[PDB]
Amino acid sequence: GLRQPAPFSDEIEVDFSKPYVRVTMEEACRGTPCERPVRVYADGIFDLFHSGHARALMQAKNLFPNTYLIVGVCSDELTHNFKGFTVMNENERYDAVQHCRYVDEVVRNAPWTLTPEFLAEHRIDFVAHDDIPYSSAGSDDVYKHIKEAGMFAPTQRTEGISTSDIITRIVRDYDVYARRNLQRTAKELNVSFINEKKYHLQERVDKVKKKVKDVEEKSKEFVQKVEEKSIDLIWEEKSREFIGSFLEMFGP
Amino acid sequence: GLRQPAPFSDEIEVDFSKPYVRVTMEEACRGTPCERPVRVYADGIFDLFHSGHARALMQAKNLFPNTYLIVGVCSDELTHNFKGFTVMNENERYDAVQHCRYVDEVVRNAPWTLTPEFLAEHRIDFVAHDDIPYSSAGSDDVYKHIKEAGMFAPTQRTEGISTSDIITRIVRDYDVYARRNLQRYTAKELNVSFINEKKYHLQERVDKVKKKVKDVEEKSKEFVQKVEEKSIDLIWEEKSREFIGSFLEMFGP
Amino acid sequence: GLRQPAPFSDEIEVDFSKPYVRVTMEEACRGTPCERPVRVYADGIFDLFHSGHARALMQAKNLFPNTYLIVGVCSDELTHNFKGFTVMNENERYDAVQHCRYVDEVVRNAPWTLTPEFLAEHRIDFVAHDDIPYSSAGSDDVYKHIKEAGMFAPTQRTEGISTSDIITRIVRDYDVYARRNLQRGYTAKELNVSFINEKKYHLQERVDKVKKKVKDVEEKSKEFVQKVEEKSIDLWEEKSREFIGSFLEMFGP
Amino acid sequence: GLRQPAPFSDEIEVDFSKPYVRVTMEEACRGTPCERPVRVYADGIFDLFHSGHARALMQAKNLFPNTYLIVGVCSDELTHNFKGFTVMNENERYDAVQHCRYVDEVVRNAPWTLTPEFLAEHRIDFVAHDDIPYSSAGSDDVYKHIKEAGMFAPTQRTEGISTSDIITRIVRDYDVYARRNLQRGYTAKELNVSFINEKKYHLQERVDKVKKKVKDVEEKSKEFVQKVEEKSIDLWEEKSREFIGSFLEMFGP
């Protein structure tokens, strides 16, 4: 078992009388001497440290028979820049990752993109992460070059677990709980009633409009009729009436 | 035959050393002595004097074997009062009736309603006219009392003839003739047609406008409804689902 | 007097064993022994039989001390042909003449021009008509040959009356009455149109009012919605700080 | 280092041919020969497993030179019952504890109170927890009997962290956000209502204008009609005096 936490990058003596030399998959998988383990670097936010992270690092720890696991954790600043908010700030996460079972070494304030000098500084043989492309601003995959170096080691993501999930359970519950403790009833009932009332009113208004339209149409029709009559008028008809009337003047 | 016209009432000597005595149907129909004829009175407007009148007076002249026919003709004034217009005034009608074949005597300016003193003055035995009730103002029949006296003698009206008819033929013809000589034209007709067309067009336009207005109103109503709906919606249950995901966008992809 | 109408020619018997022998102006004016009256012929349409006609016939009857008056009445066909229309129809005018006072005998269906044989069968001694030469057919006078025989007796037209006047009065009155009435109806139509326009304006007003009401309702609804929103908003901080704590109570202290 | 997770209790073999014999603070702190580590028990929900937990476990692991750390994780049922809810579910927390650095073995479905037999089967030498007396059930401390046995090893709570805080941050942020969003929508909603009201009024005005126009058109039409009527009326007297005469021409001169 292990009594003490994982050394931060800084705590350890490192020797430059030893040149930078990576191993290859073959002689790494044959497994390295105990003095010279294979050195692997996994990186990420590790916000709300959870099982997915942990067995990702387990996968990574197990890649080779003899392995030394260094884990880069990104700063709050960088993470808010390129990604979004952390619920837990960088220190909590450093502690968090420090406390993991498969972790030999923790690297604070780790870079979004990995550089030749980073890889040389920390003597990294391989880089463990999931094989999805990581698109962080300006790059479609920030692991592209490490993949190309033959350096990249893919891992598998746990399903059902993720920080987004852990956040969404809580938020989900609190939303309905809060909204529920708002309406706490008469008013709510009234509102429902009001909507119904409003609807009824709207219907009435529509009906009224329709009626008005009908009236207008009728008026138009009447006008048309009048016009027609006028046209017709414009003696043949009224002669029959003219004569009899004229002769009324002469008696019964 | 007869050379001279019928005496007006005035021209004749009349004697009051002879009391007023009417006869009755029986001894009148046995026929009277030549010195004492039966005396009968027929009356009316006699406007546009015609055959109906004439054989009415013939009927009347023939009522008894010996008969003297006096015919009352009403004045213009009275006739316009109680009846209507005459086309011919009273003098023309006096002449007219004077010239009839069966007429012995003419009575000018005769009364609408006959009075005891009229009947006594002119010594009238009987009064000849058609058996229709004559309704002249205030009375349902102005012959009622003469009918009751046993004095009345009915007559028959000729059919097809009457002053109204004689007037209506003329008026009928002149109406259509005149109206006909008015429209007398093609150009005018064309113009009228054009005007009508224009009117129709205008009407159509108006209708279209109305329709448009209606449509607008409908649209407005719809908008109002939508607004109401929105308000109702506003009045968390719906937008929570959207609130949460959005909230979690903040934490990354 | 005379109780009976005038015979027609065909109603009458005539002795032809009596040769046709006319009589002179002289020995006629000496007067004609009772059984040989002078026989005079007068002719015409007698349309709208009137007093001019009648007095013409009176002159005719009085031309001699003893005179027999035969009067020809021309047919509808002859008359429509050579003259013009008639408001009276030939039978009506036959009757008309029949009821005249100075007329002994009526001759139906009379000739437009008079012939030796016509004058023979009716044994006509003289002819009575006005002395204005009569132009119809191609004849510039149809009586000229009767003149030349010295068989003509002129008469005098009466004044202010003739069949045309009687027409003209009625005609006029009906022309002015018709036309007047024609205008009045148009005025009534104009009055109706006023009514219609006013009704349309009121309907428009009503519509406007309705629209206004609708608008008001909408406004009210909006206000209500706003109020609701406000209420919702209110429903939160203090009771929030209450909420969260309450919610964490459930998982423990 | 450590490539492998922590066993559970049931994953593990145990020799019961070895009787249950505890060890003193003293001879434990002298250090325990490799094959007999001291065995320490620490317990808890470990909901939202965090650094306070982990350091608690580190203390637990370091209580002696040679120490075996067994850690009980209470169930969802026990926990919901005697404590409150958990956002983490018992399997999740089993795993959580499994991945801790100082933890040799994990015990699933742990007791709320510890029993002689529980302490027997797991061969538990000591117990590591904070020294704040734990009040749940009716017990005002559930560790008191473990205290009295002298079997208790206190530990220290870390600072500024605990499962409740992690809740509270998110809670707060979402309260202010959700309320803030709701409020913006009310702000947006009011503006929308204003747009709706502005739309309503303009439209109404337009409608009114249209109506007015229609009315005007109608009026114009009426006027036109009137004019036409007038014209018609104008279109008779002179030609009247022409007419009547013309009409009397037909009956003769």
Ligand SMILES: C[N+](C)(C)CCOP(=O)([O-])OP(=O)(O)OC[C@H]1O[C@@H](n2ccc(N)nc2=O)[C@H](O)[C@@H]1O
């Ligand atoms: C910024 N980079 C790209 C340099 C480092 C990667 O950044 P990231 O966002 O992948 O960090 P993260 O904390 O989300 O993921 C950390 C590691 O845990 C793994 N992981 C995460 C969640 C999960 N349910 N299963 C996992 O296996 C990821 O594959 C990743 O390899």
Ligand SMILES: C[N+](C)(C)CCOP(=O)([O-])OP(=O)(O)OC[C@H]1O[C@@H](n2ccc(N)nc2=O)[C@H](O)[C@@H]1O
């Ligand atoms: C005023 N009165 C009642 C006193 C007299 C009658 O007035 P009147 O209107 O009957 O006079 P009139 O000139 O219309 O009718 C005169 C006479 O002719 C008769 N007559 C009239 C028209 C006709 N087609 N046939 C007729 O027999 C009527 O019966 C009446 O007897």
Ligand SMILES: C[N+](C)(C)CCOP(=O)([O-])OP(=O)(O)OC[C@H]1O[C@@H](n2ccc(N)nc2=O)[C@H](O)[C@@H]1O
């Ligand atoms: C056709 N004829 C010649 C055979 C017959 C004469 O035809 P007419 O046109 O003279 O007939 P008419 O009805 O006009 O006239 C009939 C008679 O009435 C007389 N008459 C008519 C109107 C009047 N105002 N005065 C008259 O004296 C005429 O002299 C004529 O003798």
Ligand SMILES: C[N+](C)(C)CCOP(=O)([O-])OP(=O)(O)OC[C@H]1O[C@@H](n2ccc(N)nc2=O)[C@H](O)[C@@H]1O
């Ligand atoms: C129910 N029991 C008594 C059987 C087990 C204890 O239950 P609990 O409520 O202490 O469990 P928990 O998850 O709250 O605490 C787990 C462990 O982490 C430690 N812990 C937790 C939070 C913190 N800020 N500091 C700590 O030292 C506690 O001392 C405890 O020993």
